[PDB]
Curated annotation (Swiss-Prot), chains A, B:
Sites marked Important for tRNA non-discrimination: H30, G79
Protein name: Aspartate--tRNA(Asp/Asn) ligase
SUPFAM superfamilies associated with the record: Class II aaRS and biotin synthetases, GAD domain-like, Nucleic acid-binding proteins
Family as reported in the entry's similarity comment: Belongs to the class-II aminoacyl-tRNA synthetase family. Type 1 subfamily.
Pfam (any one): tRNA-synt_2
Quaternary organization: Homodimer.
NCBIfam families reported for this sequence: aspS_bact, PRK00476.1
Keyword Ribosomal protein found: no
Alphabetized PROSITE patterns for the sequence: AA_TRNA_LIGASE_II
Main localization category: cytoplasm
EC number(s) per entry: 6.1.1.23
């Protein structure tokens, strides 16, 4: 049908018959003449209807009509040129017109952003808009960039099952009843973790898959019921090898938006990340680091600071703050499961004000500004109490400071690996009210149960779990965790010991993960890997906050599908097969 | 750990310290010396343990132990050279040994093919075998070959949802209950069909996805509950355009095994395919075509041939057949829902024998051999009755003839498109016993409901359904359907008319496919596409019959998973959430 791309027409094309196919972006009438912009994937040419049957037929045209037009390229009359677009100095004088597909009046115009429900219900229209459409095209280039790096390093692309055994690993599975086995269920996978490890036992050596993953969560934190991971695994490797290839993937991926990524990326320990930034996904686009004051307040008589941790965060020029917003700081603190946020105001003199300053000793008041590296005019925030909660509060406080003061360059890309993760977290340590709760559950995995201990934690990890370190690693971009992996356990005895920690008996381990444990009986290799949050990465590259903007047909909060009205009840006929 | 690839060692490497990591393919002892073949992905080097601690430690080694060895490359003693392998003239004199992973005695040896249950339960071991492992590596190259063609022609790779609305389209869906919506269910998709069409309405123009598809079938015909399709769609196209790009995909895919595919591929109509070969997935690696005898027997008085169709298939030299096997031909016929298979024996003279010949007229007996193009010594098989059943029988008969006579070159690749498919099949036309049954159901779709009629069937298709032709097309390889697509309907009124045919009322259409029908209100473009059976294609390229051999972790008959013992019953705790 089509002879030319709409965006390809130039002065050089004058006098030639052309045929374009696409959409009417707009129509405007002046004199007895009809003017349209004809849009296709390659861009836009103006098309005019001046005389005869074509003109009569063009009276039918409206925004988003799908059409084919035939006409003669002409240079636009003097003064009509559109300098802004590549087609700007031509137009097509239409000769023939066929309406391929009529459009009704639009639920929203394409130069408008509608509410979420409307954009999803009419996502086929939303994707005609420049931004949404380009996001999806970007995603395609992103995939290809990753694959090209992986192929260059001899990775094998392997598809893994999505109908699996329901395993008692963390998080709720989506279930699928089996017609041919009344009462039995498949589960959709959370990750291909177990499969990729089996592929290592299989001798595949270097595996990747851009894989669909499924998790039935309470769907906060910008979650989707199904999401995409770039999954990788390698045999005979240490962490450095997984990091080096990951970094090659990241460089090619960022090249897609014309950013040259400087390698290698910074690395920081979990304990250093937590100490310096109060977060294991630290945002390094600005400073405002935590300063420890525990030892500084060792001999204090101020009750609030008689705690196992005291930490500070300095707000630049924050003394000049008005009091109404200082009360909200307390609300900010409470909204997060914390009792409050103490503060010391450093007035223009260098002298300390606020409800804290008077309670400190002369010796404490004195060396304070220096210790926290504050300057006159600043507001120093303090958090005391159990270290994890106090640090998290200070980590959240520095981010809020950076928002409020614009320390945060919207063009910058700041990456880091977080390495040397503890092997375990404490199951449920703090009350919702903010206190230390009585520990019920066993130890829980920091990343996952299949994560290896570091060599000098091998003998100790089940006797001294809280201090045990792992070969796990996260990669962080602008305060977002964009990927995570680890060196795996590849011995049965070590994997059972880990399971014992988690309240999984020898018999329970064999019943639930036996297929993995037995595979380790047949010459399993050292192996390790990583998984990237592909939707997050694509969202960051497109410059949007929500991953919904980079999925073709996403769900909205609650797993509701405005496009198809899924999920929906089924018939009783379908139900009798067979659960 | 590793310094060198095991397959990379040569004479030039003599005297150098190397470190290999992989598996012990075998161990053999002679003198006080231990000899192993060390295998990794790149191949095999012999490694020897001659003196000291290494030798003592090597007494522990067995088949499939995963190890790292350090040693000095030496040229093999005169007479020891293995001319068959690239490493053949060196060996490594081991200096150090670390057992990375012990192996227990194998359930089967790697130079053996075990039974299916064993191969699946221990698929991680089965994939260490040369053939299975190479199959998976081939698959990876196959994907990449397709993607490179699609990228070259500006296709956008787009991921489509796997959690969807359960639609009343053909075939049983896998269901997924939704925790957040007690009583409601997602369905897994049969194909991305509806989504790819919406992406056309979205202006994406050229789409592809290598997609996971789900179907809960009775699991005969080498079916898997989940399978992979290469899915494609384009806007502003006719059949030729979909075929031309498909052919580019096929050429690159076949290039993976060093076959240069001659383009363009042959094309044949559905009616011609059925007439000539009694099949719409004809096997063109041999001849033995159907010859119509309907008009030839127009004036016959032999009751069996007083039928609306009579067809023949000539077996080369089949008169010299013994009688015991001629009775089995009848069983062959009955095993397929047919009453029998008539035959005429052409003896060495050219004179006709058998139970048919005597019943024909002089004039019928005479011109017979000529008409069917037989030669003395041949056996002519006949099928009479309703055309569809008789042709299918003759189509099945010619394939059996070709097996029995080896007319069938195992290296040949014979392709064809089958075009001009009828728009509809008759719902259930024949009895299991072989008779014409009373038609119950409405008309059913030949490919799917979204398939467009040809231009000169547009007004007629719902008044003269049986004669209505479509713009559907299949591509066939060596008697296998390897892909199928069509030009779509893109107007609401035409799609409702199709639904009416199928017993889907206006109200039922809007309730079940409204999201598609409404999308057609907003300037839908002409569009068309194709889906390839990716597992079948990969199986053909690997040279195996079963697609199980080209899936990393396949199910066996019944959707049973010997690897993980899925599907399995769930806990009552899990069940209370929430169906």
């Amino acid at each position: 049908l089509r002879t030319h791309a709409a965006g390809s027409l130039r002065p050089a094309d004058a006098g030639q018959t052309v045929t374009l196919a696409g959409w009417v972006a707009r129509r405007r009438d002046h004199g007895g003449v009809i003017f349209i912009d004809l849009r296709d994937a390659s861009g836009v040419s103006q098309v005019v209807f001046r005389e005869g049957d074509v003109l009569a037929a063009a009276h039918r045209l409206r925004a988003e009509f799908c059409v084919a037009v035939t006409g003669v390229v002409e240079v636009r009359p003097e003064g009509n040129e559109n300098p802004e677009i590549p087609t700007g100095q031509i137009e097509v004088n239409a000769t023939e017109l066929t309406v391929l597909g009529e459009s009704a009046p639009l639920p929203f115009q394409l130069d408008e952003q509608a509410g979420e429900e409307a954009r999803l219900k009419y996502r086929y229209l939303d994707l005609r808009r420049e931004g949404p459409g380009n996001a999806l095209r970007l995603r395609s280039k992103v995939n290809a960039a990753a694959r090209s790096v992986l192929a260059e390093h001899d990775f094998v692309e392997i598809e893994t099952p999505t109908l699996t055994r329901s395993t008692p690993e963390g998080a709720r599975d989506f279930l699928v009843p089996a017609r041919l086995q009344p009462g039995s269920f498949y589960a959709l996978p959370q990750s291909p973790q177990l499969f990729k490890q089996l592929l290592m036992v299989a001798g595949m050596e270097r595996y990747y898959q851009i894989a669909r993953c499924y998790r039935d969560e309470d769907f906060r934190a910008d979650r989707q019921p199904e999401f995409t991971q770039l999954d990788m695994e390698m045999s005979f490797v240490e962490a450095d090898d997984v990091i080096a290839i990951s970094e090659q993937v990241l460089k090619a991926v960022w090249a897609t938006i014309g950013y040259d990524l400087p390698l290698p990326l910074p690395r920081i320990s979990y304990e250093e990340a937590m100490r310096r930034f109060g977060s294991d996904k630290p945002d390094l686009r600005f400073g405002i680091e935590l300063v420890e004051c525990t030892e500084y307040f060792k001999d204090t008589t101020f009750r609030v600071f008689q705690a196992p941790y005291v930490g500070a965060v300095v707000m630049p020029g924050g003394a000049s703050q008005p009091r109404r917003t200082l009360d909200g700081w307390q609300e900010f603190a409470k909204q997060r499961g914390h009792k409050g946020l103490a503060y010391v105001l450093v007035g223009e003199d260098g002298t300390l004000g606020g409800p804290v300053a008077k309670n400190l000793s002369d010796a404490e008041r004195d060396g304070l500004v220096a210790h926290v590296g504050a300057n006159p005019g600043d507001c120093i925030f303090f958090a005391a109490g159990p270290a994890k909660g106090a640090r998290a509060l200070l980590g959240a406080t520095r981010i809020e400071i950076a928002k409020r003061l614009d320390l945060i360059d919207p063009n910058a890309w700041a990456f880091t690996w977080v390495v040397d993760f503890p092997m375990f977290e404490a199951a449920d340590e703090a009350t919702a009210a903010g206190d230390v709760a009585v520990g019920s559950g066993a130890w829980t995995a920091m990343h996952h149960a299949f994560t290896a201990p570091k060599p000098d934690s091998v003998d100790t990890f089940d006797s001294d779990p809280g201090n045990a370190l792992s070969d796990a690693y996260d990669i962080v971009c602008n305060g977002n965790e964009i990927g995570g992996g680890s060196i795996r356990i590849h011995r049965r005895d070590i994997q059972e010991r880990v399971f014992a920690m988690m309240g999984i008996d020898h018999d329970e381990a064999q019943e639930k993960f036996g297929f993995l444990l037995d595979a380790f009986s047949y010459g399993a290799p050292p192996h390790g890997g990583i998984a990237f949050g592909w939707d997050r990465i694509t969202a960051l590259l497109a410059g949007v906050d929500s991953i919904r903007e980079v999925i073709a047909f996403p769900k909205s909060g609650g797993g509701v599908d405005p496009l198809t009205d899924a999920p929906a009840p089924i018939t009783p006929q379908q139900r009798k097969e067979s659960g």
